[PDB]
């Protein structure tokens, strides 16, 4: 049956993508520190298959980790567009989620979701390294639920 075959191929490509998330080496402010602590030995994001790569062309996920300013907004959008697809965005911390504690500033974008689509929101100021990892594992479970090929088969 087709519905069986496409279901199993969809699991395969879903498994590969979530099992190999390569965030861009991208970080803006305070929360970049906790993101470093998630790569540090105690949490070791690499053991889940999560590997930072500097190039946007070789990245799957953008972790927006810090305050986004008006001056910085076009640059953030640009490297997002240069990511091949599928690409996911994780908002980390209050500044990136909604402007946080500079929400009423003239120079701050009130949430990165004005500039780019967001998949997961990680609250905190900063979120702990363990909280960010929880948000990563939630992105993986989100990728695990995709039905690209099942939707194609009924299209």
């Amino acid at each position: 049956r087709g519905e069986y075959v496409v279901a199993k191929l969809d699991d395969l490509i879903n498994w590969a993508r979530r099992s190999s998330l390569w965030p861009m080496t991208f970080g803006l402010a305070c929360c970049a520190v906790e993101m470093m602590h998630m790569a540090a030995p105690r949490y070791d994001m690499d053991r889940f298959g999560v590997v930072f790569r500097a190039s946007p062309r070789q990245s799957d996920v953008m972790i927006v980790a810090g305050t986004l300013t008006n001056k910085m907004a076009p640059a953030l959008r640009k490297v997002y567009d240069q990511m091949p697809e599928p690409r996911y965005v994780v908002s980390m911390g209050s500044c990136a989620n909604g402007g946080g504690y500079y929400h009423y500033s003239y120079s701050v974008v009130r949430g990165c979701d004005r500039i780019v689509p967001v998949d997961i929101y990680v609250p905190g100021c900063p979120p702990t390294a363990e909280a960010l990892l929880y948000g990563i594992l939630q992105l993986q479970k989100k990728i695990k639920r995709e039905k690209r090929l099942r939707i194609w088969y009924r299209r």
């Binding site: 008006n70 959008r77 009423y104 003239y106 120079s107 974008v109």
Partner: protein, 209 residues
Amino acid sequence: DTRPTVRPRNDVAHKQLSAFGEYVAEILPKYVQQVQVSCFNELEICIHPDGVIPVLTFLRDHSNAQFKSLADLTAVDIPTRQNRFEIVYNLLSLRFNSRIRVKTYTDELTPIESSVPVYKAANWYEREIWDMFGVFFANHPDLRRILTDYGFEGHPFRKDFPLSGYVELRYDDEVKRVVAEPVELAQEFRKFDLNSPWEAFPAYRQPPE
């Protein structure tokens, strides 16, 4: 000094800073308008704006001064004054282990001589004052915005500039670029009135008009 909760007073430093204050006023009477020392011992020289270069050079290079480091250069906006901007230089003397403050004034349309000739630290500090307060510094090697977005209009640190500004940014899909729009807030910043109607500090009570 034996009241556990009260900051002790250092009378010796107050006397020395008072003496050096008169000293600077005697040598540079052409520019010095006021000299004062605070109760926590910080000396201030208030000068005419023409004397920025002569005053800063004397303090850097005089042998009984030697303020070789410019700790900070900033501006204060006081709208109630005709000269609304107060330019403040904070200087450190490593030779004598002293700090001094030199303050002058200007308005929107008056230049202040760039102090890059005395301290090369002032270059970026003046770009910041130009950008956030709109005070022009004459004879700057390169004066341009340093902190605000390219093309940003206004000088955000002026007291009459709104907290959230005038424009906000979003990504518009139609034009496939980040666009600037007039600012609207889903929740307006809530202004709190906090000042107490009862006087707190009698020693600073101003005389009745």
